[PDB]
Every structure is written in C-alpha cells, then in structure tokens.
C-alpha cells in the first residue's frame, strides 16, 4: 500500500468504488431509506477491503473502523451523488428527494438541510471524483483511529494523493494547501451529520416506525 504511487492510489480507489443501487408515508420513506442503507452496507464492506492498507489490519480493527464510520460513508456518498441536483438528495437514481419531502419523516428535514448544505459546498468547490474517493477513504481510516503508524502512514499517503491531484490540476502551492484544508474541514461537518443521523435512526428504532435489518441493528448499537 505504502509503495503505491499517487496515480496508482487514485486508480485503486476509483476501481474499488461500490455500485449505485436502486430503491409517500413516514414508514414508507423510512423503509425505503433503511432498506437501501442495508443493501449499501454489504457493498461498503467489499469496498473497504479494497482501500489500500485496510486488509493489513486485524479483523478486530477492520470491524471497529467500519462500525465507527459507516453512516459517515453513506452520507458522503449521498452528498456526492446529489452534487448536480441543487435542492435535492439523490438517494438512488430512481429516488431523488426534494428538501420538503424530508418533512415526510419526523426530525428528518433538519438532517436533510445539513446534507443539502454539504452538497452545495461540494458544488461551490467543484469537488472532483478523484478527490471524493480520497476523502471517503480518509473517513474510513480516520474516524475510529484514536482508539500504530501503518494506518497513519496510509493516511499520509492519501494526503499526498490529494495534493498530487491538485498539483496536476494546476493549482499553486498556496492554493493546494488552502483547498486541502477546505476539503478536510468538510469531514468535521460529515462527522456532525453522522452523529445526528445515528440519534435519529435510534429514535426510529425505538418507535418501531420501521423494521431494521439485523446488520443495521448491529451497526447501530455499536454506537451504544
């Protein structure tokens, strides 16, 4: 992993990308969303195994990082898909939801607004696909890491790869550092949204508004 060049890292991450899966009442919509999430999760595991360095980790560590990061990963995916659809969230190619449809579920519109603002941020930055896959890999390796250098060496390699992409695009040194910072600060916002979403999902689970898969239930209670 640490012996990959920047271009090979990019190619590895692009090839590892999961498929885009296809998909009103409150239970209806939450059923559609959680059913989709559950199917995306199976594909996320395959993707994670192809992120350079991830399979070098113990099974215990792999489980921990994915339990920590899974909703962040689903969300940055959603925001990326929605970038070209101002005011809308492209959950699936056949499920493009506008802002107001979030009110169809209790407490959901607030989360929709945060996702939409992130998508809007991506759009104004003109986030590139090569940058997006780097950011997603960083989320996987970073979010649970504070609980020893191999992972940190891999993270440094992904930083190198982002900077390489920006240099390739003709940005000056000052512009590269500024854009790197802008991108990484968005990860703070994605962490925030994941925490709020996990609280929401937990609330839906308690009401029995929707049936949740065993896997989703286990990803959920990992966050205690």
């Amino acid at each position: 992993a640490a012996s990959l060049t920047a271009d090979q890292m990019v190619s590895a991450l692009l090839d590892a990308e999961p498929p885009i899966l296809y998909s009103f009442s409150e239970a209806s919509m939450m059923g559609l969303l959680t059913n989709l999430a559950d199917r995306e999760l199976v594909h996320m595991i395959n993707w994670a195994k192809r992120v350079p360095g991830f399979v070098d980790l113990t099974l215990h560590d792999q489980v921990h990082l994915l339990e920590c990061a899974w909703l962040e990963i689903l969300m940055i995916g959603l925001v990326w898909r929605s970038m070209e659809h101002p005011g809308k969230l492209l959950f699936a190619p056949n499920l493009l939801l506008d802002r107001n449809q979030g009110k169809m579920v209790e407490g959901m519109v607030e989360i929709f607004d945060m996702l939409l603002a992130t998508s809007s941020r991506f759009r104004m930055m003109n986030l590139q696909g090569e940058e997006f896959v780097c950011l997603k890999s960083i989320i996987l390796l970073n979010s649970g890491v504070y609980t020893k250098d191999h992972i940190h060496r891999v993270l440094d390699k992904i930083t190198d790869t982002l900077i390489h992409l920006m240099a390739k695009a003709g940005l000056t040194l000052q512009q590269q550092h500024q854009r790197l910072a802008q991108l990484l600060l968005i990860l703070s916002h994605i962490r925030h949204m994941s925490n709020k979403g996990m609280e929401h999902l937990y609330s839906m689970k308690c009401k029995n508004v929707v049936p949740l898969s065993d896997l989703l239930l286990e990803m959920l209670d990992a966050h205690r």
Binding site: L59, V63, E218, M219
Partner: peptide
C-alpha cells in the same frame, strides 16, 4: 457479529 462474517 454479522460484520465479522461479512468481512470473512
């Protein structure tokens, strides 16, 4: 854990 099995 299911995740354990999925990771194989």
């Amino acid at each position: 854990a299911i995740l354990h099995r999925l990771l194989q």
